[PDB]
Design goal:
The complex is a heterodimer of chains A (96) and B (11).
Chain A lengths: L10 E4 L1 H9 L7 E2 H14 L10 E3 L4 H6 L3 E3 L3 H9 L2 E3 L3
Antiparallel strand pairs in A: 1-2, 1-5, 3-4
Chain B lengths: L2 H6 L3
The chains are: A alpha+beta (96), B mainly alpha (11).
Protein name (chain A): E3 ubiquitin-protein ligase Mdm2
Subcellular location (chain A): Nucleus, Nucleoplasm; Cytoplasm; Nucleus, Nucleolus; Nucleus
Family (chain A): Belongs to the MDM2/MDM4 family.
Chain lengths: 96, 11
C-alpha cells in the first residue's frame, strides 16, 4: 500500500457503530478519508445540537451513538489526541 | 468561538 499524502487523506472503513452514525447524516459509502469522517462527525454534533450553547468546545453525548463510540458522556473538542484515539478504535485502515 | 470553528482545528 502507498503511504497517504497526509493524515487527512488516509483511507478508512468505519466499523458498524461509526458507519451507522455516518449514514445517519447522509453518508452513502463504506470507505472514506479521515477528513470526510471528521466532517460527518462535526455535522452529526451540529445537527443533533450536542455542543454546549455557551461553551461550544464542550460536547454532550451521553448514551447517543457518539457517546457509545467514544465511551464518555461528554468531551472537550480541545482534547485533539484523545478524540483521534477514540475515532481510530472505530476504523480500519484500507489500501491507497 | 463556535463549535464549527473548534472542530475545524482538528483536521
Amino acid at each position: 500500500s502507498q503511504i497517504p499524502a497526509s493524515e487527512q487523506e488516509t483511507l478508512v472503513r468505519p466499523k458498524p457503530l461509526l458507519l451507522k452514525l455516518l449514514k445517519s447524516v447522509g453518508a452513502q459509502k463504506d470507505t472514506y478519508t479521515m477528513k470526510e469522517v471528521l466532517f460527518y462527525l462535526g455535522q452529526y454534533i451540529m445537527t443533533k445540537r450536542l455542543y454546549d450553547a455557551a461553551q461550544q468546545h464542550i460536547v454532550y453525548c451521553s448514551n447517543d451513538l457518539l457517546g457509545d463510540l467514544f465511551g464518555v458522556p461528554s468531551f472537550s473538542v480541545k482534547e485533539h489526541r484523545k478524540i483521534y484515539t477514540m475515532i481510530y478504535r472505530n476504523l480500519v485502515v484500507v489500501n491507497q | 468561538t463556535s463549535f464549527x470553528e473548534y472542530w475545524x482545528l482538528l483536521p
